[PDB]
A paper describes a structure:
To understand the broad neutralization mechanism of PW5-5, we determined the cryo-EM structure of PW5-5 complexed with the stabilized prefusion ectodomain of Omicron XBB S (6 P) and SARS-CoV S (2 P), respectively. In SARS-CoV S–PW5-5 complex, two confirmations were observed: the monomer state and the 2 up-RBDs, 2 Fabs state. The S RBD–PW5-5 Fab region was locally refined to 3.04 Å resolution. PW5-5 interacts with SARS-CoV RBD in a similar way, burying 978 Å2 surface area. Sequence alignment between SARS-CoV and SARS-CoV-2 in the RBD region showed that PW5-5 epitopes were highly conserved, with 11 of the 13 residues in contact with SARS-CoV-2 being identical, and the high similarity between the two RBDs was consistent with PW5-5’s cross-reactivity in binding and neutralizing SARS-CoV. Compared with S2H97 (IC50: 2046 ng/mL), PW5-5 has significantly enhanced neutralizing activity against SARS-CoV (IC50: 10 ng/mL), increasing by ~200 times. The binding epitope of PW5-5 are highly overlapped with FD20 and S2H97, hidden in the inner side of highly conserved RBD, including the key epitopes R355, R357, K462, and P463 covered by both FD20 and S2H97, as well as the key residue E465 involved in the formation of three hydrogen bonds in FD20 epitopes.
In this study, we reported the isolation of potent and broadly neutralizing mAbs from a vaccinated donor with a special five-dose COVID-19 vaccination schedule. One mAb, named PW5-570, displayed the most potent neutralizing activity against all SARS-CoV-2 strains prior to BA.5 variant, and another three mAbs, named PW5-4, PW5-5, and PW5-535 were found to broadly neutralize all sarbecoviruses tested, including all the current SARS-CoV-2 variants, SARS-CoV, Pangolin-GD, RaTG13, WIV-1, and SHC014. Cryo-EM analysis demonstrates that these antibodies have diverse neutralization mechanisms, such as disassembling spike trimers, or binding to RBM or SD1 to affect ACE2 binding.
Numbering used by the authors:
A (entry chain H): 1 to 218
B (entry chain A): 321 to 514
C (entry chain L): 1 to 213
Write the structure that this text describes.
């Protein structure tokens, strides 16, 4: 079956260039229109990025005229996108999609890739600051906890409770790009008042690009 | 140099519709003058653009086609027509920016004794996509379970035309050359003369 | 260029009713439309091409329509795996242009629940490094409409507060909201009574929870 495999994440700097590949397999990569779309977090996708892999035919959008340059390789069957002059408004997921028609015609996209999360900032490490289960705000038979994280740029991260034991109320809020330039996460959990103190409550941060794992008891 | 459009029309033989062939004419200097001057074209029906603008717009990469229809099937080769040669033989898109060129060959590709050398597909699951070439000979059946040619409800997927020379003007071998202009915003490779 | 506009942009329906997604263009374009479906987290999926043709693998419940300047995608019976964002795409002709809409998210309609208000005082471990922040929790609320405002000595505050809302939970079809008020260490000790005001539709009165340091 047709499947488009892409590369992984790629963090770049505000002013460098990004080169993301799109390997195609499962079909004849000779007569098929290839495209490239990008979805901003919360926003939508808006550009064509139509690349004709036959010899050299390309066509770009209006907002992306001299910033993007695409190319194809009939030997490896993989198209390449090169976006230069990365500003602070290009942090988004880049997709590569095929076409439903053949090379002369054009229609909607049918087979999509997997995405390429590209961001533009400086890397750092995380910091775990536990919240406080205030005994005064325990109305309703239950309580609340927290493992509020601090500024950290890379976000292939995750949290848990007792190494994944308790899975009731593991609501983990998405990160937010603070004014400093990094991200911050949050994770609370609701437990009965009768289980206060007896059951342990320790989160587990698994920030891989920082090699920092801090387990703090609330 | 001169665009290789002469070999597209002047050829020793053309494939059938079920196995139509294409070209990759690019990086040339076309003329578009050997098509308007002569009058041996039966149906010169361009779509998308007009015949006058073909000499001015710089196309990126043009694509030619070649197949032989059963005379009265040229009408089915059109952006929107259906039948038996436009759903599982050669599908043309609605937004087709090209020109259809058909001319009669009742004396070059016909025989008084029999010309059983051109076939077409008339049994296929579903319909085809624009610019799709399905070269296959597997048996056909309403359900699955690929059967043998000897069966009760399984038949061959292709049928021979059977062109003659002692018939009407309808059942005659016509050679259709479908040009497909691809106008991408790329470095111009094929422009007009001068 | 042809700017595609989607009017609702938020369609809350029940699991089993019919959808009325719309996609209206600016000019009088042809029937060259394309609906999509992007599950949160995954990649977009082709739903209806040419505004009247069903794609491969798409169930029979999806049936689009439309012509000229009034398009509509109507789902016969909604399914629990059919709640996602739907985009409609228009293709130009000469300069190979493509335009997308804004996305009409489809969520599950559920009984309006009261948001359980909770506030977390900042720990002394963060005070040693400055930038003290207070977190207010809002859990188990169906409608994504909550005005989370703090009370600096019975006053207002804005700019220094960022809110984060999760997605609809598959268990009870509720949401969760967490607001964080960023401040300074020397600024936190200026006041004593910090309050979190919650203005929700399901609440008959704005619930305000406060604590004394």
């Amino acid at each position: 079956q047709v499947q488009l495999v892409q590369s992984g994440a790629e963090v770049k700097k505000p002013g460098a260039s990004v080169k993301v590949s799109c390997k195609t397999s499962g079909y004849t990569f000779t007569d098929h229109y290839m495209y490239w779309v990008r979805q901003a977090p919360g926003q939508g996708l808006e550009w064509m990025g139509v690349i004709n892999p036959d010899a050299g035919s390309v066509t770009y959008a209006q907002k992306f005229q001299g910033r993007v340059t695409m190319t194809s390789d009939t030997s490896t069957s993989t198209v390449y996108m090169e976006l230069s002059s990365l500003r602070s408004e290009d942090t988004a997921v880049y997709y590569c999609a095929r076409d439903l028609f053949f090379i002369p015609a054009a229609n909607s996209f049918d087979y999509w890739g997997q995405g390429t999360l590209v961001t533009v900032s400086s890397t750092k490490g995380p910091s775990v600051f536990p919240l406080a289960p205030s005994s005064k705000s325990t109305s309703g038979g239950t309580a609340a906890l927290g493992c509020l994280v601090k500024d950290y740029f890379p976000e292939p991260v995750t949290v848990s409770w007792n190494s994944g034991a308790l899975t009731s109320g593991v609501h983990t809020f998405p990160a937010v790009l603070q004014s400093s330039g990094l991200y911050s996460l949050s994770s609370v959990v609701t437990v009965p008042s009768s289980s206060l103190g007896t059951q342990t409550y320790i989160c587990n941060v698994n920030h891989k690009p920082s090699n920092t794992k801090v387990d703090k008891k609330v | 140099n001169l665009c290789p459009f002469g070999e597209v029309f002047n050829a020793t033989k053309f494939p059938s519709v079920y196995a139509w062939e294409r070209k990759k004419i690019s990086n040339c200097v076309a003329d578009y003058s050997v098509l308007y001057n002569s009058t041996f074209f039966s149906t010169f029906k361009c779509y998308g653009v007009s015949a006058t603008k073909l000499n001015d717009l710089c196309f990126s990469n043009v694509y030619a086609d070649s197949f032989v229809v059963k005379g009265d099937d040229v009408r089915q080769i059109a952006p929107g027509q259906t039948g038996v040669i436009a759903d599982y033989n050669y599908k043309l898109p609605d937004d087709f920016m090209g020109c259809v060129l058909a001319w009669n060959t009742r004396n070059i590709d016909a025989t008084s004794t029999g010309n059983y050398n051109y076939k077409y597909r008339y049994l296929r699951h579903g319909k085809l996509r624009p610019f799709e070439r399905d070269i296959s000979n597997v048996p056909f059946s309403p359900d699955g379970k690929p059967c043998t040619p000897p069966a009760l409800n399984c038949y061959w997927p292709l049928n021979d035309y059977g062109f003659y020379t002692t018939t009407g003007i309808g059942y005659q071998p016509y050679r259709v050359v479908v040009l497909s202009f691809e106008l991408l915003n790329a470095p111009a490779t094929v422009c007009g003369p001068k | 260029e042809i700017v595609l506009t989607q009017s609702p942009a938020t369609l809350s329906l029940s699991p089993g009713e019919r959808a009325t997604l719309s996609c209206r263009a600016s000019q009088s374009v042809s029937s060259y439309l394309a609906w999509y479906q992007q599950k949160p987290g995954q990649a977009p999926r082709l739903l209806i091409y040419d505004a009247t043709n069903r794609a491969t693998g798409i169930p029979a419940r999806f049936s689009g329509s439309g012509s000229g300047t009034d398009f509509t995608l109507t789902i016969s019976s909604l399914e629990p795996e059919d709640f996602a964002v739907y985009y409609c795409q228009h293709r130009s002709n000469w300069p190979r242009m493509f335009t997308f809409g804004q996305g009409t998210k489809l969520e599950i309609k559920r009984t309006v629940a009261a948001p359980s208000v909770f506030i977390f005082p900042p720990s002394d471990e963060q005070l040693k490094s400055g930038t003290a922040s207070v977190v207010c929790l809002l859990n188990n609320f169906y409608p994504r409409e909550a005005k989370v405002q703090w009370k600096v000595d019975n006053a207002l505050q804005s700019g220094n507060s960022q809110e984060s809302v999760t997605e609809q939970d598959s268990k009870d079809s509720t949401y969760s909201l967490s607001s964080t008020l960023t401040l300074s260490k020397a600024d936190y000790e200026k006041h004593k009574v910090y309050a979190c005001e919650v203005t929700h539709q399901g609440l008959s009165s704005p619930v305000t929870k406060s604590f004394n340091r």
